[PDB]
């Protein structure tokens, strides 16, 4: 091969979290929402097969799979935790997926709600032609 290529795509992870003015009967003090998206509302579904949110073990059904945009989870709870997020690619070759450990932190009563954004850049060195055309459609 004479030529080679590196394709770069941008992801945006983030979450919002707001103190409820009255906790639920379970003691859930917060409503929060975590998401994975592209910037400028770009269509990352062109190359994203699914997004898996691994919630803390205390949750029921902690494996939350989003096969279509929006890639997000909305929940109520009482404490922050590390949230591993797996972004699976429409790619038979490697890399098959990528992983981010997302800090889902919550703020105290009386303070502003959490609004956090994490920008991540992915680089794919010499993808297959089929995966490359998907990456470039995004």
């Amino acid at each position: 091969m004479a030529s080679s290529c590196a394709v770069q795509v941008k992801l945006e992870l983030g979450h919002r979290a707001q103190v409820r003015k009255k906790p639920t009967v379970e003691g859930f003090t917060h409503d929060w929402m975590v998401f994975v998206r592209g910037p400028e509302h770009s269509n990352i579904q062109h190359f994203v097969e699914k997004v898996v949110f691994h919630l803390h073990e205390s949750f029921p059904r902690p494996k939350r799979v989003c096969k279509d945009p929006p890639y997000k989870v909305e929940e109520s709870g009482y404490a922050g935790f590390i949230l591993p997020i797996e972004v699976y690619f429409k790619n038979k070759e490697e890399p098959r997926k990528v992983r981010f450990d997302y800090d889902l932190f919550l703020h105290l009563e009386g303070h502003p709600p959490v609004n956090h954004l994490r920008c991540e850049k992915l680089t794919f060195n010499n993808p297959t032609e089929d995966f490359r055309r998907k990456l470039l459609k995004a």
């Binding site: 917060h30 404490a79 922050g80 703020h107 105290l108």
Partner: peptide, 8 residues
């Protein structure tokens, strides 16, 4: 700033 407890 200050944050809640964590699942721990």
């Amino acid at each position: 700033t200050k944050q809640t407890a964590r699942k721990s």
